[PDB]
Design an enzyme around this catalytic site. Structure first.
Site, PDB file in Angstrom:
ATOM      1  N   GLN A  53       0.944  -1.107   0.087  1.00  0.00           N
ATOM      2  CA  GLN A  53       0.090  -0.006   0.127  1.00  0.00           C
ATOM      3  C   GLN A  53       0.927   1.391  -0.080  1.00  0.00           C
ATOM      4  O   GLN A  53       0.184   2.421  -0.248  1.00  0.00           O
ATOM      5  CB  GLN A  53      -1.078  -0.029   1.344  1.00  0.00           C
ATOM      6  N   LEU A  93      -7.271   1.897   4.129  1.00  0.00           N
ATOM      7  CA  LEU A  93      -6.702   3.157   3.838  1.00  0.00           C
ATOM      8  C   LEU A  93      -6.506   3.339   2.282  1.00  0.00           C
ATOM      9  O   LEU A  93      -6.498   4.582   1.740  1.00  0.00           O
ATOM     10  CB  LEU A  93      -5.232   3.299   4.390  1.00  0.00           C
ATOM     11  N   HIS A 150      -7.171  -9.589   5.981  1.00  0.00           N
ATOM     12  CA  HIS A 150      -7.286  -8.284   4.846  1.00  0.00           C
ATOM     13  C   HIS A 150      -5.940  -8.012   4.506  1.00  0.00           C
ATOM     14  O   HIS A 150      -5.654  -7.662   3.360  1.00  0.00           O
ATOM     15  CB  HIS A 150      -7.995  -7.321   5.735  1.00  0.00           C
ATOM     16  N   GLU A 151      -4.847  -7.973   5.644  1.00  0.00           N
ATOM     17  CA  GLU A 151      -3.631  -7.490   5.205  1.00  0.00           C
ATOM     18  C   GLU A 151      -2.846  -8.515   4.291  1.00  0.00           C
ATOM     19  O   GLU A 151      -2.180  -8.051   3.511  1.00  0.00           O
ATOM     20  CB  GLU A 151      -2.753  -7.101   6.393  1.00  0.00           C
ATOM     21  N   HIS A 182      -3.268  -8.076   0.711  1.00  0.00           N
ATOM     22  CA  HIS A 182      -2.676  -7.186   0.015  1.00  0.00           C
ATOM     23  C   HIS A 182      -1.450  -7.641  -0.433  1.00  0.00           C
ATOM     24  O   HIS A 182      -1.067  -7.168  -1.709  1.00  0.00           O
ATOM     25  CB  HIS A 182      -2.400  -5.645   0.985  1.00  0.00           C
TER      26      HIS A 182
HETATM   27 ZN   LIG Z   1      -6.462  -2.751   3.277  1.00  0.00          ZN
END
Ligand SMILES: [Zn+2]
EC number: 3.5.1.88
Length: 168
Positions: free
Chosen positions: A50, A91, A132-133, A136
């Protein structure tokens, strides 16, 4: 340092991270900026991809008073079971929330800030977070779980919201 967080539809969000080769001081100040950026944006998790750093690093802190920062470097998922869902955010998808199907219980292996391996069993918000992470790190966003229709409106709401960001 606070790093810039990418938003959809940035294609760099879809890159598969490389495993960290060695946890040295370059790695440990990636972690520190990631935490600083996280808290600055008020998130509970952030993946390296991210912030346009495509290696396998995730920071999480669910805490009220920042007493238990959690660092997962080179996370691997050993077991999962059950199923839940809460209304997630990200985010990188500013101000959108959706119920995403997750496992309820999760066992992971990973390294900490000192490159020492640990194992963690997690349920609740923690287990949803970790999933969730980790997603990514392989180029998966939570909106990917939703209908084509649901995805459209997400993509638009965000584009509008940045339309203002770069502001003038
Ligand atoms: Zn996220």
């Amino acid at each position: 340092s606070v790093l810039q967080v990418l938003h959809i539809p940035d294609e760099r969000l879809r890159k598969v991270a490389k495993p960290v080769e060695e946890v040295n001081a370059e790695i440990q100040r990636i972690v520190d900026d990631m935490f600083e950026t996280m808290y600055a944006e008020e998130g509970i998790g952030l993946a390296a991809t991210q912030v346009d750093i495509h290696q396998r690093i995730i920071v999480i802190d669910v805490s009220e008073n920042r007493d238990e920062r959690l660092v997962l470097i080179n996370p691997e998922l050993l077991e999962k079971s059950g199923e839940t869902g809460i209304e997630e955010g990200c985010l990188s998808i500013p101000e959108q929330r959706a119920l995403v199907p997750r496992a309820e219980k999760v066992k992971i292996r990973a390294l900490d800030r000192d490159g020492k391996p640990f194992e963690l069993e997690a349920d609740g918000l923690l287990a949803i977070c970790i999933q969730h992470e980790m997603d990514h790190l392989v180029g998966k966003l939570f909106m990917d779980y939703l209908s084509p229709l649901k995805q459209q409106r997400i993509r638009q709401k965000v584009e509008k919201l940045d339309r203002l960001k770069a502001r003038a």
